[PDB]
Amino acid sequence: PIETVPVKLKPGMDGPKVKQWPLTEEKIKALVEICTEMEKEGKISKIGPENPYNTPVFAIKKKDSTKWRKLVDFRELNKRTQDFWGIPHPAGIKKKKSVTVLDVGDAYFSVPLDEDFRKYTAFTIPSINNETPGIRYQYNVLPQGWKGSPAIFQSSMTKILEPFRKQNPDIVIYQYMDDLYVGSDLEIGQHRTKIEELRQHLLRWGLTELHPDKWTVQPIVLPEKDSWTVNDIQKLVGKLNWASQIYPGIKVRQLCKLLRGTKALTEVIPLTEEAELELAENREILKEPVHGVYYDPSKDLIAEIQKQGQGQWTYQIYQEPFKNLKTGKYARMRGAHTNDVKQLTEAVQKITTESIVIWGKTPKFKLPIQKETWETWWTEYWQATWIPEWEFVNTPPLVKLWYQLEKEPIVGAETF
Amino acid sequence: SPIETVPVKLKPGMDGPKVKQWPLTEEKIKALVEICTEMEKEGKISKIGPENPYNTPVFAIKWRKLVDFRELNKRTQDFWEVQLGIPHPAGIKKKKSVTVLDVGDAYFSVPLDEDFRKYTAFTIPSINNETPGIRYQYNVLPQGWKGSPAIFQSSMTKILEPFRKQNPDIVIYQYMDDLYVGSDLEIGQHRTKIEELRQHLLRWGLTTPKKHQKEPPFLWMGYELHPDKWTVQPIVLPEKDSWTVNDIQKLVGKLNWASQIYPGIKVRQLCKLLRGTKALTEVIPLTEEAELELAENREILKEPVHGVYYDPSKDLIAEIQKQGQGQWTYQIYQEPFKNLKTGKYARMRGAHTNDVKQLTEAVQKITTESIVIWGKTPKFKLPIQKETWETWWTEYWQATWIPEWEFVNTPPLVKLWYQLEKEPIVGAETFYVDGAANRETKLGKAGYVTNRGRQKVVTLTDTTNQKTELQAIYLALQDSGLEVNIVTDSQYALGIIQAQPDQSESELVNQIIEQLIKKEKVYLAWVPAHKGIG
Ligand SMILES: CC(C)=CCOc1cc(NC(=S)c2ccoc2C)ccc1Cl
Numbered sequence: 001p002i003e004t005v006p007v008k009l010k011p012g013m014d015g016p017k018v019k020q021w022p023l024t025e026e027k028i029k030a031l032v033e034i035c036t037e038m039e040k041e042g043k044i045s046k047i048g049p050e051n052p053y054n055t056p057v058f059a060i061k062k063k064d065s066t067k068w069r070k071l072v073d074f075r076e077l078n079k080r081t082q083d084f085w086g087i088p089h090p091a092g093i094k095k096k097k098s099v100t101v102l103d104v105g106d107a108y109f110s111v112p113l114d115e116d117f118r119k120y121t122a123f124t125i126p127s128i129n130n131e132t133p134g135i136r137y138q139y140n141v142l143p144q145g146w147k148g149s150p151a152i153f154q155s156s157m158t159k160i161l162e163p164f165r166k167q168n169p170d171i172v173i174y175q176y177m178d179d180l181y182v183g184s185d186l187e188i189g190q191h192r193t194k195i196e197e198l199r200q201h202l203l204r205w206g207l208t209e210l211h212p213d214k215w216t217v218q219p220i221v222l223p224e225k226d227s228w229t230v231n232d233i234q235k236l237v238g239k240l241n242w243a244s245q246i247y248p249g250i251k252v253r254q255l256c257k258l259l260r261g262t263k264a265l266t267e268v269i270p271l272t273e274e275a276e277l278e279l280a281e282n283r284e285i286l287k288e289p290v291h292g293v294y295y296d297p298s299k300d301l302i303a304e305i306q307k308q309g310q311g312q313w314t315y316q317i318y319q320e321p322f323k324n325l326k327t328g329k330y331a332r333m334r335g336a337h338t339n340d341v342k343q344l345t346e347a348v349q350k351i352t353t354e355s356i357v358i359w360g361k362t363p364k365f366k367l368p369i370q371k372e373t374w375e376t377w378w379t380e381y382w383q384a385t386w387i388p389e390w391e392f393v394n395t396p397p398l399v400k401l402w403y404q405l406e407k408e409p410i411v412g413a414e415t416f
Numbered sequence: 417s418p419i420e421t422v423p424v425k426l427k428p429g430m431d432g433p434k435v436k437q438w439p440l441t442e443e444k445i446k447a448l449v450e451i452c453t454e455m456e457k458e459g460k461i462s463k464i465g466p467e468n469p470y471n472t473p474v475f476a477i478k479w480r481k482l483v484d485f486r487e488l489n490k491r492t493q494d495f496w497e498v499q500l501g502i503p504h505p506a507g508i509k510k511k512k513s514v515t516v517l518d519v520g521d522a523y524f525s526v527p528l529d530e531d532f533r534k535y536t537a538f539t540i541p542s543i544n545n546e547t548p549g550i551r552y553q554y555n556v557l558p559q560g561w562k563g564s565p566a567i568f569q570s571s572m573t574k575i576l577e578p579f580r581k582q583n584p585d586i587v588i589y590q591y592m593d594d595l596y597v598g599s600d601l602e603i604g605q606h607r608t609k610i611e612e613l614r615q616h617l618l619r620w621g622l623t624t625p626k627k628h629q630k631e632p633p634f635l636w637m638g639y640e641l642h643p644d645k646w647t648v649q650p651i652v653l654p655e656k657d658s659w660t661v662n663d664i665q666k667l668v669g670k671l672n673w674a675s676q677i678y679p680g681i682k683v684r685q686l687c688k689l690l691r692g693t694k695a696l697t698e699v700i701p702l703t704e705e706a707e708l709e710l711a712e713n714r715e716i717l718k719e720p721v722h723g724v725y726y727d728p729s730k731d732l733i734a735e736i737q738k739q740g741q742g743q744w745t746y747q748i749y750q751e752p753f754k755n756l757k758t759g760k761y762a763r764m765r766g767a768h769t770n771d772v773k774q775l776t777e778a779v780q781k782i783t784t785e786s787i788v789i790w791g792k793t794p795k796f797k798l799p800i801q802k803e804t805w806e807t808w809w810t811e812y813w814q815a816t817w818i819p820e821w822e823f824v825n826t827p828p829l830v831k832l833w834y835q836l837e838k839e840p841i842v843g844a845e846t847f848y849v850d851g852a853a854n855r856e857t858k859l860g861k862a863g864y865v866t867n868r869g870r871q872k873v874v875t876l877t878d879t880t881n882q883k884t885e886l887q888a889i890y891l892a893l894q895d896s897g898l899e900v901n902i903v904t905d906s907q908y909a910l911g912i913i914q915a916q917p918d919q920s921e922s923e924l925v926n927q928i929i930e931q932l933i934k935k936e937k938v939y940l941a942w943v944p945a946h947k948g949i950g
Contacts, residue, residue, distance in 0.1 A: 019497075022784065025791035049495040049566035050422050122496070128791040129507035131589055133499060133573055231840045234903070234943045241944045256948030262848050264867040265840035265901040265941065309811045340815040369815035376780050376787075377817065395813050397914045397942075 001110070007117045007148055009080045015053035015120040016076035020134065021375070023126055027059045030068035031125050034059070035137060043109050044137040051138065053122040058379050062103070071145065072123055075387055078147045080120075086151055089360035093174045096183030098191050099210035099357060102199070105144035105178030105385055107207050108153055113141055121146070144178045145385055160205055164198050176356050178385035183212070212357055217326055220286045220405040222279065231265045233258055239405070240282060242398045246322045247285045254278040293323045295359060301325075303351050303363035304393075305344070306400040311337065313347050314403040317355060317363055326354070329406055344369060345381040352388045365390040417525055417621035419575070422567050424532040425493050432470040432535035433487035437549060440476060440541050447479035448540050452552055460524050461552045464537060468551065472538045483538055485561050491535075495566040503589065505639045505646045506748065506757035507789035510725040511587070511598035513606040514643050516630040517614065519572070520593030522622040523564060526557045526571050536561070575620050579613055588613075596634070598643075638673065639723075648677050648721040653714050662696045664689050671713060676759040679745075680716050682709045724754040726790060732756075734782055734794030738771070738830050741919060744778040748786070748794055757789070768917040768925065771830045772808045775800060776816050783819060796821035800830040808832060813914050833918040834932045837939040844899035844937060845870070847892035848950070851884030851906070860884040864892045882908055886924045893931035893938075900938055905945035913940050 009015065023031075038044045055077055059068040093099065113121070121139040142149040150157075154175075161173060171184040171194070182198060184191050199208070220243070225232060237252045237259065244250040254274040263269075271279075295301075299319040306314045311332035318324045330350065332343040348365060355363045367374065371392045426432065440448070455461045475482040528536070536554035557564040572590055580588065586609060589596040597613060599606050614624055633640040633647070640647045651674055653667065668683050668690075675681040685705040693700065702710065730750040737745045742765060747758040761781060764774050775798065783793050798821050809816055840846075846867045853860025853876065862884040863873035872891060876884060885906040892902045912925075918933070920926050932938055943949050 022787045023791065024787060024793075028791060048422050049498070049563075049570045050424060050493070052494045052496050054496060124496075129503045129789050130499060130501040131503050131508065131587070133569065133590065136496065229840070231941060234941060234949070237947065237949075238942060238944050241947075252947070259943070259947065259949040261950050262846070262865050262867050265846045265903065265939065266842045267867075307813055307815055338817075340809070340817045344815045367815070368813065370777075372780050372784070373776070373816060376784055395914075397813075397910045400813065400914075 002112065004112045004114045005152055007114050007152075008082050009120070010082050013080040015122075016055050016074075016080065017053055018056055018073070018076050020054065020056050020124045020126050021058075023058060025128055027068070028125060028128065030059045031057065031070060032135070034068065034070045035125060035135065038109075039137070041109075043141045044139050047122060047136045047138045049136075051119050051122050051136070053120050055121065055123045057123040057125065060379070060382050062383050071382070071385065072143060073387055074143065074145045074147075075389065077120060081146070081148055084148075084151045086154065087175065090172050090174050093172045093181060093183050094212045094358045096172060097185040097211060097213055098188065099181050099183040099212060100192070100195050101210070101353070102180040102182065102195075102202070102207075103178055103385065104157070104175070104180050104202065104207050105149075107157070107205070108142035108144055108149045108178075110206060111142045111149075111153055111156075113139055113143070117148075145387075147177070150175060150177055160202065164201050168194065174357075174360065176360060176386070179356075181210075181357060183210075210353070210357065215326065215328070215354060217289055217324075218328065218406045219288070220402070221407045222283055222286065222405065227268050228271060229265070230259065230263055230267050230269060233269060235401075239398065239402055242402060243286075246290055249285045250282050251278055290323065293318075293325060295319070295325055297359075301355060301359060301361060301363040302366065303348075303355065303388075304366040304399075305347060305351075305368055306395050306403060307340070307344075307368045308400065308404055311343060313343065314400070314406070315347065315351055316403065317351070326358070327403065327406070329408070339381075341369070341373065341377045342381045344374075345378050348388060348390075349382070349384050352384070352386070362386065362388040364388070366393045367391070368393060368395045417527055419527055419571055419620055421527045421529045422563075422570065424529040424563055424567075426491050426535070427493050430491045433472055433491060434470060435473055435484075435487050437471060437539040437541050438473045438475060439545060442543055444476040444479070445541055445543065448474060448476050448481055449550065450479070451481045452540060452550070455524075456552070458524075460554070460556050462533075462555050464534075464551050464553045466551075468534055468537045468553070470535050470537045472536065474538045474540060483558060483560060485536075485558060488535055489562040492562040495563055498566040498569060499591075501788070502591065502637070504757070504789050505636065505641060505723065505725070507726050508641075509587075509727070510645070511643050512600045513603055514596055514598040514632060514634075515606070515610045516634065517595040517597060517610070517617075517624045518593060518628055518630065519595055519617065519622050519624050522572075522617075522624075523559055523568060523593060524556050525621045525623070526564075526568055528554055528556050528558070575617065575622070579616050583609060594630075645725065646723045650720075651717055653710065653717065655714075658699055659689070659702055660697050660699050661690065661693045664700065667710075674713075674717060677721050678716050678719070681713055685709050724749075724751070724756060726750075726756055732786070732790060732792055732794040733797060734786070735797040735824065735826075736775070736778060736782070736799065737826065738775070738799060738828055741771075742774060744774070746778065746782055748782070766919075766921065768911070768915060768920040768922075770808075770833075770916065770918045772800065772804065772832065773812075773814075773816065775830050776818055779818050779821075793819050797824040798822075798830075799824060799826050799828065804829075804831055807835075833929070834916070834935070834938070836913060836916055836932075837937055839939065840941070841899050841901050841937050841939050844901050844939070845896055846901040846903065847896060849885075849888035849892045849902055849904050851881070851886070851888035853879050853881045853884045855881055862887040862891060864888060864895075870895065882906070883924055885909070886922070886928060890924065890928050890931065893928060893935065896935075898936035900935060901941065902938070903941045903943055905943055905949070909940060910942045913942060 056073040058071055060071045062069050118138050121143055123137060125135040127134060142152060157175060165173065171182060174181045182195060184194065186194055233255055237255050240250050240252050254272060255278055258269050258275055296319055301317060301319060303315055303317050308314055313330040316324045316327040330347045333346055336342045352362050365388055367390050369392055456463060472488055473484050533553050533555060536558055538552055540550035542549050557568055569590055576588060585599060587598045597610055617624060633642045635649060638649055640649050651670060664686060668686055671681055671683050689700045689706055727750055732750060734746060734748045739745045742763040745760040747755050749755045761778055779796060786793050796819060802823055847864045849864040851860060851862040858878045860876045860879045861873055862876060865871045886908065889902060889904055889909060918929055
């Protein structure tokens with residue numbers, strides 16, 4: 001219930017005209033409900049055919065609910081929407097013992113959207129077998145998932161938070177899209193309890209477990225063996241040689257001199273003292289991340305993933321090749337054994353949130369999946385309000401073999 | 417009519433059309449002058465004056481009339497896609513009764529944004545381009561104009577809302593100038609409701625007709641739709657004695673469409689006739705084999721294919737068969753032998769892949785289709801063992817998946833033709849292969865040397881470097897026993913290890929695959945080239 005701010009698209013940019021992808025019956029039924037309701041609540045209005053724009057819409061089941069949530073894919077609109085030069089990234093956020101995320105998307109509907117910009121929010125509810133025309137709507141209020149919403153609603157959000165921020169100045173609160181990331185060092189109990197205190201507060205307007213200090217960067221651990229065979233060295237030499245693109249001090253000269261001759265692949269080879277040292281120097285280089293790697297706010301953040309097998313995945317976040325900002329391993333979550341797509345999806349979300357917490361922006365993903373496989377099913381397992389960008393790739397055999405080498409816990413993360 | 421108009425506009429900064437009125441005879445003009453006085457009184461058009469700089473050519477074919485809006489259209493804004501995705505017989509539900517209402521004339525029943533009308537101006541010529549012609553313009557959606565389809569449907573949608581609300585148990589499908597109204601009410605109650613609908617429409621000026629009256633079955637996408645089930649409109653193959661390429665291509669096209677519904681259709685020999693054709697009208701005699709399969713097909717096509725509609729209360733089952741390398745067939749049903757849909761996918765041919773992968777692809781295409789048709793995914797019955805699936809997928813480099821499925825022992829079963837060993841083979845000969853060629857002279861050598869002292873080299877001409885490398889791997893495979901360790905510095909061999917393809921675009925690779933498949937144990941190892949590696 002306020003006045004509206006004039007929003008425009010970047011110069012020369014036209015509205016999105018993205019086709020609605022096919023939805024399951026359940027998904028369509030939920031949207032119809034959700035949409036007649038918002039229509040009645042005046043948040044959206046049916047539109048004519050004279051409006052040519054469109055944005056894909058779908059429904060997710062956020063953590064802990066049987067109620068479906070309407071999720072719109074405003075990626076295209078976002079990219080076309082002008083800039084507002086939001087909040088800078090509170091570097092401190094990444095140094096908290098615990099960080100909790102909260103969905104404040106519901107705060108936006110309480111704000112009117114510039115009428116001149118509504119045409120561009122056009123979305124369509126499809127019909128099964130195309131027996132009914134699609135139900136075309138557009139927004140009247142700030143939509144969840146549009147970069148303009150958290151922006152316009154910034155002034156109101158800051159106000160409603162000051163009280164808590166000052167009452168608790170040791171806590172850090174960062175907002176991204178429909179999300180709010182609350183970070184504090186308080187013990188889990190005094191933390192989670194302090195969160196609800198924030199909730200209740202945030203709650204009196206109309207709104208309703210991360211550990212950054214444990215996202216350590218891991219080292220490559222080269223195999224150590226009692227006795228080495230021709231094959232062992234070869235496998236080794238190939239990886240190290242690849243690895244030399246990251247660490248130029250890595251060498252396989254002495255080792256490759258052992259690979260001289262046409263002996264059987266399973267034959268044991270004695271390591272010359274020169275070879276021994278060579279391995280030792282190498283293991284030392286790999287004892288640390290390569291120097292001179294700094295994040296650049298002007299660069300796009302990239303996130304590559306490799307399928308390791310057995311529910312295992314590896315990823316690296318960089319902006320320039322071979323200069324990782326972070327790397328890690330990802331094990332499938334319980335109840336996902338038979339689903340490659342669910343595992344990948346869960347991983348993309350995990351990595352994106354990390355990317356958000358650390359740099360306050362999402363990475364562009366390089367995914368080891370065929371476009372059709374992904375597009376057919378990723379939504380079935382999506383739970384975030386935002387959606388990162390992605391491209392489908394072919395994993396080079398070596399990249400997988402190399403990061404397969406990362407170090408794991410002695411035993412793991414122990415707790416009775 | 418009392419229907420609100422839709423605000424229309426011209427594309428970004430363009431101006432309305434100004435194409436000159438084609439010249440016509442007195443016979444053609446006296447006819448158009450006729451038709452337009454009619455439309456003019458029906459309120460469809462309005463005689464305008466000199467205050468209009470726009471114009472569209474009007475023609476006269478039989479004495480009917482035709483306005484060429486090609487120009488106006490190319491200047492008219494764009495509208496959100498007018499239903500381009502239609503229903504598929506496999507997805508509609510059976511109805512006790514279905515009635516089709518021709519609301520065609522309703523095209524000229526919908527008002528046109530008053531503001532836009534000036535652009536629809538056209539001129540009825542003078543007997544001899546002497547006196548000024550008769551100027552007019554449209555007050556309603558012009559037949560053949562770009563925004564008519566979209567606007568007519570949206571308008572039809574608004575009008576039908578009340579009725580649709582009041583009669584939930586009645587389905588109305590809007591297509592073109594038709595309204596297919598179905599229901600499971602008693603035939604008298606149905607007939608009664610159609611009349612109520614027909615009247616409701618009449619209230620908005622939309623008048624619908626017994627003569628023109630359409631009746632079931634209905635022709636749709638090549639099927640004849642009956643209220644309780646569907647059938648394939650029989651397809652006839654023109655028995656001739658003179659086949660030109662056009663005849664042969666068209667034929668192959670229709671046969672191709674039939675392979676979806678009819679089993680056993682084949683075009684391999686007919687396609688052979690197209691080789692090296694010098695022209696469309698070229699007459700190519702049918703070989704014997706062509707005369708033959710074209711004979712079996714005429715038969716297969718004489719068989720009546722009937723089908724069933726979608727019953728939401730029952731399971732959706734999708735069965736898949738591997739009718740050949742890269743070729744897949746499927747049928748989706750709820751009750752055994754009563755298919756909703758069948759079809760097959762063009763032989764999947766690529767750079768390099770494997771049967772299990774291809775399978776998952778056929779599975780995803782069906783799934784994408786099913787989500788559209790039924791908004792649900794079928795339970796799959798696949799000709800592959802759960803073990804074969806678990807072994808392949810859990811280790812493949814690429815993310816892949818298959819929705820809930822069950823194994824069905826309907827040979828031929830899809831399997832893993834071979835599996836590279838995960839560790840070197842103790843006691844197996846070890847071939848150190850290498851190939852090299854001059855990329856410019858295309859001259860190269862390929863060979864191997866084993867820990868056992870066996871050696872071989874071969875000189876090749878008009879070859880590429882990758883081919884020599886692969887041929888080196890090929891010779892090792894050819895010359896080794898049932899178990900062999902092979903080491904190469906070929907980057908391509910690195911892909912083969914990771915993907916383990918059982919089909920490739922490269923004949924050489926395929927030859928290699930045939931060797932791989934034949935061995936009992938094969939360990940393929942890669943090492944970087946140009947090292948201290950001997
Ligand atoms: C695709 C099409 C023109 C269908 C109309 O004909 C039929 C439709 C149905 N059943 C349904 S669900 C229906 C009724 C009106 O519109 C639809 C989409 C059954 C048999 C026939 Cl013969």
